[PDB]
Amino acid sequence: TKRCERVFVEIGAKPIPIQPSAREKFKILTQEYQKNAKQQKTPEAFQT
RNA sequence: UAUGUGAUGGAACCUCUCCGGAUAAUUCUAUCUCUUCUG
C-alpha cells in the first residue's frame, strides 16, 4: 500500500539531551523486530 | 677455569590433606505489519 515517503526538513530548535535508557530500548526493539521476522517467515527483500 | 701429602653430597621421595559436586518435565496459540490525503 505504500504511496508516499516522508522527508524531514531542518528547523531551528535547541538540541535536547537523550536519556541513557533510550538506546537500551532501541536495542531491545531491534532484536524484537528480527525475531518476529524469522518467526513470521516474511520476505527479506520486502522486509519493511 | 682448578692448584697437589685428605671431597661418604649416590649424604635428602616435593612429600602430606580435598566426591567435577549442585539446580532445571524437550516442552508449546494470538496475530504480524505503518503512512492514508482534503473526501
Method: cryo-EM
Nearest Cα neighbor of A34 from A48, A14, A19, A18 is A48
Give, in Å, how far the C1' of B4 lies from the CA of A13. 104
Please, are residues A33 and A42 in contact by the beta-carbon 8 Å criterion?
A: no
Using the CB atom, is residue A33 less than 7 Å from strand B? yes
Using the CB atom, is residue A30 less than 7 Å from strand B? no
The CA angle A10-A15-A18, to the nearest 5 degrees, is: 120
Please, are residues A12 and A22 in contact by the beta-carbon 8 Å criterion?
A: no
For residue A10, give the C-alpha cell: 531542518
For residue A3, give the C-alpha cell: 504511496
A14: Cα within 13 Å, side-chain hemisphere? 2
Using the CB atom, is residue A41 less than 7 Å from strand B? no
For residue A26, give the C-alpha cell: 532501541
Using the CB atom, is residue A6 less than 7 Å from strand B? yes
